[PDB]
Design an enzyme around this catalytic site. Structure first.
Site, PDB file in Angstrom:
ATOM      1  N   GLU A  29      20.242  24.822  34.484  1.00  0.00           N
ATOM      2  CA  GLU A  29      21.631  25.262  34.618  1.00  0.00           C
ATOM      3  C   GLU A  29      22.312  25.495  33.266  1.00  0.00           C
ATOM      4  OE1 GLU A  29      24.113  22.396  36.738  1.00  0.00           O
ATOM      5  OE2 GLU A  29      25.152  23.986  37.820  1.00  0.00           O
ATOM      6  N   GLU A  50      47.450  43.540  37.854  1.00  0.00           N
ATOM      7  CA  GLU A  50      48.526  42.651  37.442  1.00  0.00           C
ATOM      8  C   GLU A  50      47.975  41.303  37.001  1.00  0.00           C
ATOM      9  OE1 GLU A  50      51.896  42.747  40.277  1.00  0.00           O
ATOM     10  OE2 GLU A  50      51.393  44.856  40.616  1.00  0.00           O
TER      11      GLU A  50
HETATM   12  N1  LIG Z   1      29.530  26.916  46.965  1.00  0.00           N
HETATM   13  C1  LIG Z   1      28.197  26.978  46.987  1.00  0.00           C
HETATM   14  N2  LIG Z   1      27.509  26.848  45.847  1.00  0.00           N
HETATM   15  C2  LIG Z   1      26.169  26.948  46.019  1.00  0.00           C
HETATM   16  C3  LIG Z   1      25.488  27.156  47.199  1.00  0.00           C
HETATM   17  N3  LIG Z   1      24.123  27.204  46.969  1.00  0.00           N
HETATM   18  C4  LIG Z   1      24.001  27.029  45.675  1.00  0.00           C
HETATM   19  N4  LIG Z   1      25.199  26.867  45.032  1.00  0.00           N
HETATM   20  C5  LIG Z   1      25.347  26.641  43.583  1.00  0.00           C
HETATM   21  O1  LIG Z   1      24.697  27.696  42.895  1.00  0.00           O
HETATM   22  C6  LIG Z   1      23.908  27.179  41.799  1.00  0.00           C
HETATM   23  C7  LIG Z   1      22.451  27.478  42.046  1.00  0.00           C
HETATM   24  O2  LIG Z   1      22.327  28.907  42.173  1.00  0.00           O
HETATM   25  P1  LIG Z   1      21.796  29.693  43.439  1.00  0.00           P
HETATM   26  O3  LIG Z   1      22.872  30.711  43.848  1.00  0.00           O
HETATM   27  O4  LIG Z   1      21.321  28.842  44.557  1.00  0.00           O
HETATM   28  O5  LIG Z   1      20.569  30.523  42.864  1.00  0.00           O
HETATM   29  P2  LIG Z   1      20.274  32.057  43.143  1.00  0.00           P
HETATM   30  O6  LIG Z   1      21.468  32.875  42.682  1.00  0.00           O
HETATM   31  O7  LIG Z   1      19.932  32.247  44.574  1.00  0.00           O
HETATM   32  O8  LIG Z   1      19.037  32.420  42.215  1.00  0.00           O
HETATM   33  P3  LIG Z   1      17.507  32.083  42.470  1.00  0.00           P
HETATM   34  O9  LIG Z   1      17.464  31.232  43.748  1.00  0.00           O
HETATM   35  O10 LIG Z   1      17.033  31.366  41.262  1.00  0.00           O
HETATM   36  O11 LIG Z   1      16.856  33.442  42.709  1.00  0.00           O
HETATM   37  C8  LIG Z   1      24.260  25.699  41.696  1.00  0.00           C
HETATM   38  O12 LIG Z   1      25.321  25.499  40.770  1.00  0.00           O
HETATM   39  C9  LIG Z   1      24.664  25.350  43.130  1.00  0.00           C
HETATM   40  O13 LIG Z   1      25.567  24.251  43.209  1.00  0.00           O
HETATM   41  C10 LIG Z   1      26.251  27.292  48.415  1.00  0.00           C
HETATM   42  O14 LIG Z   1      25.806  27.474  49.545  1.00  0.00           O
HETATM   43  N5  LIG Z   1      27.609  27.188  48.203  1.00  0.00           N
END
Ligand SMILES: Nc1nc2c(ncn2[C@@H]2O[C@H](COP(=O)(O)OP(=O)(O)OP(=O)(O)O)[C@@H](O)[C@H]2O)c(=O)[nH]1
Ligand SMILES: */O=C(/[N][C]([C]([O])C(=O)O[C]1[C][C@@]2([O])[C](OC(=O)C3=[C][C]=[C][C]=[C]3)[C]3[C@]4(OC([C])=O)[C]O[C]4[C][C]([O])[C@@]3([C])C(=O)[C](OC([C])=O)C(=C1[C])C2([C])[C])C1=[C][C]=[C][C]=[C]1)C1=[C][C]=[C][C]=[C]1
Ligand SMILES: Nc1ncnc2c1ncn2[C@@H]1O[C@H](COP(=O)(O)OP(=O)(O)NP(=O)(O)O)[C@@H](O)[C@H]1O
Ligand SMILES: Nc1nc2c(ncn2[C@@H]2O[C@H](COP(=O)(O)OP(=O)(O)O)[C@@H](O)[C@H]2O)c(=O)[nH]1
Ligand SMILES: [Mg+2]
Ligand SMILES: [Mg+2]
Lengths: 426, 332, 426
Positions: free
Chosen positions: C172, C243
């Site tokens: 991350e 805006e």
């Molecule tokens: N609000 C929210 N955040 C999420 C969710 N799933 C993952 N996250 C956040 O997104 C981050 C992880 O990224 P993901 O979006 O799962 O990864 P991706 O964009 O699918 O990329 P790859 O899986 O690596 O191809 C972390 O900070 C998680 O907390 C969800 O369902 N809701």
């Protein structure tokens, strides 16, 4: 997409793999006739990952069975799920391996390997998008060790951009099972370090301990031990085959567990692990499962995790559960036992989640640990090997097949380098 | 031990803020702002420096030490298009003759010295030429070859098993092996360099002398590394990009080795990951081991290459810190 | 009319978008089919149907496969839902360089086509994650391409920030910093939350003991709706996306709002409570009710925007703002005395059945830029340093086209940003 090619080499690898297929077939609703009789569309959505479909709704593991003697594979065929395999996927010789890496890698295995490779190539060509290769083998024999090492090398030469993972059954220093075990293991690892992206390291001692302490099993069968391994293996790839809240690719798991190219030897674990009787005293919380996963008694490698530190940990949870509950619990674990978590990595763990439990459980979890402690296992094998080499014991069986002292020395140097690297990142 | 020798060679820009200035033979000025940074090595050659001058400053000493029984390594390190191949080999059909780089000049010098030494000592010279393409080894002396791998030795030498070893009596014979092999080394076109080297070229001369009996054996490694490449500048895609990924990775591990050695050279504990790449493994002796090593860092002046030039200089500066322990490889 | 475009990238963004679209459908009166300023988010067909002015991207097929079998399925037109082959593998260098430079063109063409429907293309919405592999590099690439094409048009990012303590992936920290390197010089405005804060809010204000992704996503959806409704609906003192850019971007580089939504009240706690306008404003400015781990007392609010909804009176709001200004604890920047924008919509927020929130006549969305957020940035840079010192988990990135100096340049940029924030505070 992301379909996986399965290979079983040597006796242990083949028998484990049979159970693995049995487990996964049950999971995906595939009966021993190759017919689907499940109740969910989720069950078939990603069946491509392990199976090919034939006319008449027949499904066939993309699996290759390899052996230098026929008996093991004959027993597999005779078995219940043995008739699901496509018969041309049995590749086997008749000349024995003598627990001899040289026979598997140099001589008898070299004669058979090209035919195996051709079947591998056909399976690759039948893939919409090949993800990688899963191998099952022992470390201490001749077929799994020598032959399996050979096969992996050739496949990485052919598919250098793909995932190569092994479930490798390793020696347990307190109870050796063969006399030349250290030789076979060191020769194998010398090439697994270079040509695999991840190796899941199981020793039978730890499995026996699990069976005795938690499962209350006085009399473990090899079938039950294989079930334990199979459950781990299924758990590892659940998120390729199913939906999830937060999902895990095999590459991503490598992506989170490998800080340095060489350090890809994992201790697998599982939860829940109780008897039929010590379950009604328990309820099934994410906390409970995590506690069980980080219990040394639920480790499948031969080490006390407290004799080292976790570099990285991956947990894969199955079932409906609160992400925040999970994250909070793991943070508490990190806070309370911070000394066992290397301080280079904030957020020492990765979590993955699969919105689907394995049958008859509400919740389950699989654990993947990469610990500096596992250096002790390598130390023990290196010492065992070294003593025998000092007296050149048993060596004529291998020198007679062309192997040289320098190669053995190189293997030992590799082992020592591995342990040194773990020491450095202690 | 003896510290490695680091030289910086400034290639001329093609026919204009330079961002690089030559203070003296010993020092250079880079133009980073607001605050300056000064670098000093063993010798810096500006854009005008001739091929002969480079040979005299860097290579002549190593050839002589090779004759005396020491192992010796010269390798060119730098960003893509900085001049590594031009320095090591020369132009490839340009002016051509005087432009020939360090490798052909070393052949000439070495053989003249041995001819002179002849007037009961005898000499035996073998050559090998291999490339490290995508962490794979290819034999430039035989295109048919396959299945080359690295192996450690009691001679402490890490060598390529099954590489063609060509015996050469004269500079001219060596030139033939080099010309054939040079054609062999893989090159592709990138935006940064039409002639870009896609592999690390290792030309090795084994020099063995017998004074009859005392046996002196020297390994001379003449390495033309591939260069670090940004995809945005190179526009490498497909196979070219795959090659770039491998080049950057093996170069990254080279940097890791060099940094680790600096830590260990000072009282510290560190592991050098020599076997992380085939390059670092083959070069293991050259870096902190039993060999006299000289590194030629190639840089392009020019503001565009500012960041890459910084990186090359920083790497070279660290390299200067590494001490080797070179002994005469003898036998009686 | 003034009309928009929606892009949901990476698993997380897609999930958020599902909830958002459900909310929109419930608000404007649209079914699962498409049956019945509504055209900012719904283009009409020949008859009956309405098509979400949307784009859905993920390299994992499993995410969008789920969408394609759910209830919300034939609302979407399959032109929009794009899928890849192999996922991003939590690796910026796969999302930007390798697999990104393959399907990005298709998505761009789709976007162009959708624009050729908009007479008044007001701008875009991008939903992603400073933390996914897809969402970190691919998002950046898309932003770059959009800048190349349009430039003048309005662009927004809904960015799920790395929670300082809790974290989810192993890399991350790298991903987020790489995203910052590239997005910062394109996207004029980014609206940000983190999950930890939302979880806290669920625990405290809503009394929810199980924190999960669906309800969390619903909260974000509500914020999105509040931000939009100025375009989607009537009201005195209306708002445009441009805006926001004008109002919440003092210097062109500093453009990272926080968000918050009040009331966050359950079924019971709505009673035993009046819910006045001033009260709601006070709640919005509370240290704990903020949607990121950032104490607003540890800095100064530069520029603030407040988007009141439903039964609201301007005079009351003005009085509340005066009261807030009077409070000496909530500090403002010396040089900006006028640090408020008022937005009032006669449409009251409508909550999705089977969810967290209850009916509230009057609600606010508060969007604020502060010197206090810099602490989070500093923490992230510290994390990055700690793991870049070892250079661990770097062999994933180097293989897909990367350089060592890039990371250093990114860190320099972050330092410069921090310095700028400090100057602003001074
Ligand atoms: N609000 C929210 N955040 C999420 C969710 N799933 C993952 N996250 C956040 O997104 C981050 C992880 O990224 P993901 O979006 O799962 O990864 P991706 O964009 O699918 O990329 P790859 O899986 O690596 O191809 C972390 O900070 C998680 O907390 C969800 O369902 N809701
Ligand atoms: O392994 C197979 N299937 C599992 C699950 O889908 C499943 O149904 O598990 C059963 C397994 C039983 O037997 C227990 O496990 C064993 O005793 C066992 C023996 C040998 C090796 C490993 C385990 C089960 C237990 O194991 C598993 C795998 O769940 C052991 O600790 C756990 C906790 C369970 O709670 C326990 C104790 C049970 O008692 C449980 O019974 C009840 C009434 O709930 C059982 C299961 C949940 C059990 C007694 C029947 C699977 C796991 C991972 C991936 C895929 C599948 C399997 C498949 C086909 C045929 C036979 C077994
Ligand atoms: N000192 C020099 N004088 C004249 N031309 C030079 C000089 N150095 C390099 N060049 C020219 O630049 C081009 C070569 O770049 P080269 O020097 O081959 O780059 P390189 O370092 O080998 N690139 P790469 O293989 O990608 O790392 C050649 O055609 C040379 O003639
Ligand atoms: N789990 C499990 N382990 C086995 C099995 N058979 C052998 N092993 C282990 O594998 C190792 C021996 O290697 P083996 O596969 O029998 O030799 P090979 O047939 O030449 O490959 C020892 O450590 C055994 O304990 C089995 O059926 N299940
Ligand atoms: Mg070159
Ligand atoms: Mg994803």
């Amino acid at each position: 997409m992301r379909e996986i090619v399965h290979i079983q080499a040597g006796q242990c690898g083949n028998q484990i793999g049979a159970k693995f297929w049995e487990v996964i077939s049950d999971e995906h609703g595939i009966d021993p006739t190759g017919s689907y009789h499940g109740d969910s569309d989720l069950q078939l959505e990603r069946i491509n990952v392990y199976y090919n479909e034939a006319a008449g709704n027949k499904y066939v593991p993309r699996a290759i069975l390899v052996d230098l003697e026929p008996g093991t594979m004959d027993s597999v065929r005779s078995g219940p799920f043995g008739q699901i395999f496509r018969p041309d996927n049995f590749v086997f010789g008749q000349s024995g391996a003598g627990n001899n890496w040289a026979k598997g890698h140099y001589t008898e295995g070299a004669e058979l390997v090209d035919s195996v490779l051709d079947v591998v190539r056909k399976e690759s060509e039948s893939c919409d998008c090949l993800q990688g290769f899963q191998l099952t083998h022992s470390l201490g024999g001749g077929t799994g060790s020598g032959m399996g090492t050979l096969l992996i090398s050739k496949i990485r030469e052919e598919y250098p951009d793909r995932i190569m993972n092994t479930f490798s059954v390793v020696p347990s220093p307190k109870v050796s099972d063969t006399v030349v075990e250290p030789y076979n293991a060191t020769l194998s690892v010398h090439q697994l370090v270079e040509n695999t992206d991840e190796t899941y390291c199981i020793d039978n001692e730890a499995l026996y301990d699990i069976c005795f302490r938690t499962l209350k099993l006085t009399t473990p069968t090899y079938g039950d031990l294989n079930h334990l391994v199979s459950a781990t293996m299924s758990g590892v790839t659940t998120c390729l085959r199913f939906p999830g809240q937060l999902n895990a690719d095999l590459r991503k798991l490598a992506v989170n567990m490998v800080p340095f190219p060489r350090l890809h030897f994992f201790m697998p674990g599982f939860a829940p692990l109780t008897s039929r009787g010590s379950q009604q005293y328990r309820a099934l919380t994410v906390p409970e499962l995590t506690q069980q996963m980080f219990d040394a008694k639920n480790m499948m490698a031969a080490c006390d995790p407290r004799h080292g530190r976790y570099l990285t940990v991956a947990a894969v949870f199955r079932g409906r559960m609160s992400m925040k509950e999970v994250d909070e619990q793991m943070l508490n674990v990190q806070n309370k036992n911070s000394s066992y978590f290397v301080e280079w990595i904030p957020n020492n763990v990765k979590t993955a989640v699969c919105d689907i439990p394995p049958r008859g459980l509400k919740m389950s979890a699989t654990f993947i640990g990469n610990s500096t402690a596992i250096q002790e296992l390598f130390k023990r094998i290196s010492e065992q090997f070294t003593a025998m080499f000092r007296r050149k014991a048993f060596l004529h069986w291998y020198t007679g097949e062309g192997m040289d002292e320098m190669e053995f020395t190189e293997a030992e140097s590799n082992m020592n380098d591995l342990v040194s690297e773990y020491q450095q990142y202690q | 031990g003896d510290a490695i020798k680091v030289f910086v060679r400034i290639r001329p820009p093609a026919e204009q803020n330079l961002s690089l200035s030559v203070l003296s033979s010993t020092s250079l000025r880079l133009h980073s702002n607001p605050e300056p940074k000064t670098f000093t090595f063993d010798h810096v050659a500006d854009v005008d420096t001739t091929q002969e001058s480079v040979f005299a400053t860097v290579a002549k000493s190593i050839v002589e030490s090779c004759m005396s029984g020491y192992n010796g390594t010269i390798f060119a390190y730098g960003q893509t298009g900085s001049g590594k191949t031009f320095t090591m080999m020369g132009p490839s059909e340009s002016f051509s003759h005087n432009l020939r780089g360090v490798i052909p000049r070393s052949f000439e010098y070495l053989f003249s010295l041995i001819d002179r030494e002849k007037e009961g000592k005898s000499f035996l010279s073998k050559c090998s030429f291999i490339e490290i393409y995508n962490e794979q080894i290819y034999d430039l002396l035989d295109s048919a070859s396959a299945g080359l791998y690295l192996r450690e030795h009691i001679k402490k030498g890490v060598f390529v098993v099954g590489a063609v070893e060509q015996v050469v009596t004269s500079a001219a014979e060596a030139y033939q092996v080099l010309s054939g092999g040079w054609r062999n080394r893989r090159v592709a076109s990138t935006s940064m360099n039409r002639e870009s080297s896609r592999s690390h070229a290792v030309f090795t001369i084994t020099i063995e002398s017998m004074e009859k009996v005392n046996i002196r054996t020297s390994l001379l490694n003449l390495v033309d590394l591939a260069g670090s490449e940004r995809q945005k500048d190179t526009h490498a895609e497909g196979m070219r990009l795959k090659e770039a990924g491998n080049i950057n990775r093996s170069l990254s591990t080279l940097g890791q080795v060099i940094t680790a050695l600096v830590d260990v050279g000072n009282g510290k504990q560190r592991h050098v990951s020599y076997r992380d790449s085939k390059l670092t493994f083959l070069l293991r002796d050259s870096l902190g081991g039993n060999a006299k090593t000289a590194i030629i860092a190639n840089v392009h002046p020019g503001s565009r290459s500012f960041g890459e030039t910084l990186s090359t200089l920083n790497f070279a500066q660290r390299a200067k810190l590494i001490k080797n322990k070179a002994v005469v490889n003898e036998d009686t | 009319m003034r009309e928009c475009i929606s892009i949901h990238v990476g698993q997380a963004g897609v999930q958020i978008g599902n909830a958002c679209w459900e909310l929109y459908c419930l608000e404007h009166g649209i079914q699962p089919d498409g049956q019945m300023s509504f055209n900012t988010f719904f283009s009409e067909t020949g008859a009956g149907k309405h098509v979400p002015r949307a784009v859905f991207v993920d390299l994992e097929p499993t995410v969008i496969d789920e969408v394609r079998t759910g209830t919300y399925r034939q609302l979407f037109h399959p032109e929009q839902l794009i899928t890849g082959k192999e996922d991003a593998a939590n690796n910026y260098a796969r999302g930007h360089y390798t697999i990104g430079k393959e399907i990005i063109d298709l998505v761009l063409d789709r976007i162009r086509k959708l624009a050729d429907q908009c007479t008044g293309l007001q701008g875009f919405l991008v939903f992603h994650s400073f933390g996914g592999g897809t969402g970190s590099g691919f998002t950046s690439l898309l932003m770059e391409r959009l800048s190349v094409d349009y430039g003048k048009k309005s662009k927004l990012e809904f960015s799920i920030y790395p929670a300082p303590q809790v974290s989810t992936a192993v890399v991350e920290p790298y991903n987020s910093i790489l995203t910052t390197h590239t997005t910062l010089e394109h996207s004029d405005c980014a609206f940000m939350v983190d999950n930890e804060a939302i979880y806290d809010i669920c625990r405290r204000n809503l009394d929810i003991e199980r924190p999960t992704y669906t309800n969390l996503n619903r909260l974000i959806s509500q914020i999105v709706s509040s931000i939009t409704a100025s375009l989607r609906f009537d009201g005195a003192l209306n708002v445009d996306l441009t805006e926001f850019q004008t109002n919440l971007v003092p210097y062109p580089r500093i453009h990272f709002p926080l968000a918050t939504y009040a009331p966050v009240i359950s079924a019971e706690k709505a009673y035993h409570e009046q819910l006045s306008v001033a009260e709601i404003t006070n709640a919005c400015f509370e240290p704990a009710n903020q949607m990121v781990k950032c104490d607003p007392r540890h800095g100064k609010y530069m520029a603030c925007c407040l988007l009141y909804r439903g039964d609201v009176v301007p005079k009351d709001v003005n009085a509340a703002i005066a009261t807030i200004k009077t409070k000496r604890t909530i500090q403002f920047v010396d040089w900006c005395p006028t640090g408020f924008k008022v937005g009032i919509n006669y449409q009251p927020p409508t909550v999705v059945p089977g969810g967290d929130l209850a009916k509230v006549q009057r609600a606010v969305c508060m969007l604020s830029n502060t010197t206090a957020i810099a602490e989070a940035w500093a923490r992230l840079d510290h994390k990055f340093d700690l793991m870049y010192a070892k250079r661990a988990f770097v062999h994933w990135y180097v293989g897909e086209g990367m350089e060592e100096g890039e990371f250093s340049e990114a860190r320099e940029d972050m330092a410069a940003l921090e310095k700028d924030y400090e100057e602003v505070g001074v």
